[PDB]
Design a protein around this nucleic acid. Structure first.
Lengths: 313, 274
DNA sequence: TGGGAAATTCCT
DNA sequence: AAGGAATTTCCC
């Protein structure tokens, strides 16, 4: 077709705490995979081999196996009904989505909120039965002033807004970008291949948080290992966490040690009492510096490495 | 007539109030001196009577103008919020093994209150306009509106006695005090040894590490920034009285909360010579 | 903006 | 029963 949707940048995938309804008014936003130190970045998208003016929309989609409408809604900017509508059709077709919020739905308000979401899109010209039920492959930018969803066809969105209520994952969400170009006069009928980005995983989600070692008891020990160490950390899950010591070797090589501790050794998801592992070579005569890090056994995600120092017996 | 005297006061701090959704019945109210093995139960002692009747265990507030506390006491024989059963004959000492202390959201506050008046729950009878405003949800005093019988079979309601304060151990500002474990338990009699203490939720703004010992009293040095997410305190040890001890001294250390002046179970700590 | 704590529903 | 954790709300 030529003009589609290119995501020139994306969020950080993990860092932002998707705020809810009763948490207060825009107490932040969705940054982007770009620390910079001075400035920052938001999810910026663009259109390649584009056309003239054009308006791109964005709807929160569900991760899962079968992409469908997500209960949560985007807020702020050109958003309305959880779907942001941006223009940016001058000369360039690069549109940046800054200061976007994500509202988390009640574990109860899912079904009810879902149903409606699957109507605000059906009636409108964007993602019809290609994000709800593949029986309404049409009814998108058909131009219809407002298609009356028959007690038959509206019952399709119902059944979809019923089964998908039990599959829904309230902690992870993905941004969907759908851009429509002009057609006949000026209305934006035709749409360019919608493209989903990565998952942004809620921060207030234990099994997704950003690991950190606030501080530790001692930062050194004997090569023999087996010395007790106290670690204070940011929220973690007793069953899915591990301390990992490591080091770089000549050319190719990386030593690896795990702290010995039972989940029972994790105090209120914020502390861990473990024992150091034996160092690569307990025969060393001079202190050897290694690095300690916190890692999640599941997503193998790590934390800021801390300079641990091993020394001779 | 006769008097009411509660034998097993409710464990000051232990139970954690449950919301309806919280699997409702999931445990009772432990007897004051309950233990991991020897479970006890709040037993009343109605002296001056030995026959049938009734008991209406209600839940008020901890302060004199004892208004009826909004959230319900659910479980066995608990209706409309309170509790209403009977009194065993060859029994002049009845206990209550089945009673959960359910909490009311703030959202459902005033409703619970109207449900307090619509049910005729008011042990000491406090004017409706008085029984309003703010309430202390994190604490209650179980009431006992038991009915006896004078020497003619006529029912008789005695003094509605109150139970020792019951604090929602789920409440950070009055939960129990526990020292799970500690970095080290020796340190020099000169003090200054950093300790890592893991504890049950504590409020940094109101907490301290108390070091007892015959004729000696001091506290560990730390700061708000040193308390980690309410479950850990990194503090420095206090100097011992004898800045040149000659032999190990086994002092005691416990968590102290100023506000309610309470202390955690003591934990052995031994100051070593210089 | 953040981001910790209190709230309160969820799950052995 | 006897607890530890999840995710919304509640504020500093």
């Amino acid at each position: 077709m030529g003009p589609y949707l290119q995501i020139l940048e994306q969020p950080k995938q993990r860092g932002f705490r998707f705020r809810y309804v009763c948490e207060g008014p825009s107490h932040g936003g969705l940054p982007g995979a770009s620390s910079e130190k001075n400035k920052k970045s938001y999810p910026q998208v663009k259109i390649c081999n584009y056309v003239g003016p054009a308006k791109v929309i964005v709807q929160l989609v569900t991760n899962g196996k079968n992409i469908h409408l997500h209960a949560h809604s985007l807020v702020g900017k050109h958003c309305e009904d959880g779907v942001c509508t941006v223009t940016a059709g001058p000369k360039d077709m690069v549109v940046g989505f800054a200061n976007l919020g994500i509202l988390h739905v009640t574990k109860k308000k899912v079904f009810e909120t879902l149903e409606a979401r699957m109507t605000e899109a059906c009636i409108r010209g964007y993602n019809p039965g290609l994000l709800v039920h593949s029986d309404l492959a049409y009814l998108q930018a058909e131009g219809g002033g407002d298609r009356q969803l028959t007690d038959r066809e509206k019952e399709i969105i119902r059944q979809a807004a019923v089964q998908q209520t039990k599959e829904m994952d309230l902690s992870v969400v993905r941004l969907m970008f759908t851009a429509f170009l002009p057609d006949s006069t000026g209305s934006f009928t035709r749409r360019l291949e919608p493209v989903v980005s990565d998952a942004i995983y809620d921060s207030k989600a234990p099994n997704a948080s950003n690991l950190k070692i606030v501080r530790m008891d001692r930062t050194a020990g004997c090569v023999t290992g087996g010395e007790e160490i106290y670690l204070l950390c940011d929220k973690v899950q007793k069953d899915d966490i591990q301390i990992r010591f490591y080091e770089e070797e000549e050319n190719g090589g990386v030593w690896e040690g795990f702290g010995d501790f039972s989940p029972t050794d994790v105090h209120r998801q914020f502390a861990i009492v473990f024992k150091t592992p034996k160092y690569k070579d307990v025969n060393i005569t001079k202190p050897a510096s290694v690095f300690v890090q916190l890692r999640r056994k599941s997503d193998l995600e790590t934390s800021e490495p801390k300079p641990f120092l091993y020394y001779p017996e | 007539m006769a008097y009411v005297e509660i034998i097993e006061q409710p464990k000051q701090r232990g139970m954690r109030f449950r919301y309806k959704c919280e699997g409702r019945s999931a445990g009772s109210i432990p007897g004051e001196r309950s233990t991991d093995t020897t479970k006890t139960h709040p037993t009343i002692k109605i002296n001056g009577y030995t026959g049938p009747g009734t008991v209406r265990i209600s839940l008020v507030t901890k302060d004199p103008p004892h208004r009826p506390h909004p959230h319900e006491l659910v479980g066995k024989d608990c209706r409309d919020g309170y509790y209403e059963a009977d009194l065993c004959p060859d029994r002049s000492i009845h206990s209550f093994q089945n009673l959960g202390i359910q909490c009311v959201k703030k959202r459902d506050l005033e409703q619970a209150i109207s449900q307090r008046i619509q049910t005729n729950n008011n042990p000491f009878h406090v004017p409706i306009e008085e029984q309003r405003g703010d309430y202390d949800l994190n604490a209650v005093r179980l009431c006992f509106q038991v009915t006896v019988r004078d020497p003619a079979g006529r029912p008789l309601l005695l003094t509605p006695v109150l139970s020792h304060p019951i604090f929602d151990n789920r409440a950070p500002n009055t939960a129990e005090l526990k020292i799970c474990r500690v970095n080290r338990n020796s340190g020099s009699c000169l003090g200054g040894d950093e300790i890592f203490l893991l504890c049950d939720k504590v409020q940094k703004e109101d907490i301290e590490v108390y070091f007892t010992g015959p004729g000696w009293e001091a506290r560990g040095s730390f700061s708000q920034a040193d308390v980690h997410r309410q479950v850990a305190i990194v503090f420095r040890t206090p100097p011992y009285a004898d800045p040149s001890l000659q032999a190990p001294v086994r002092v005691s250390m416990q968590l102290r909360r100023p506000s309610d002046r309470e202390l955690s179970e003591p934990m052995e700590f031994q100051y070593l010579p210089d």
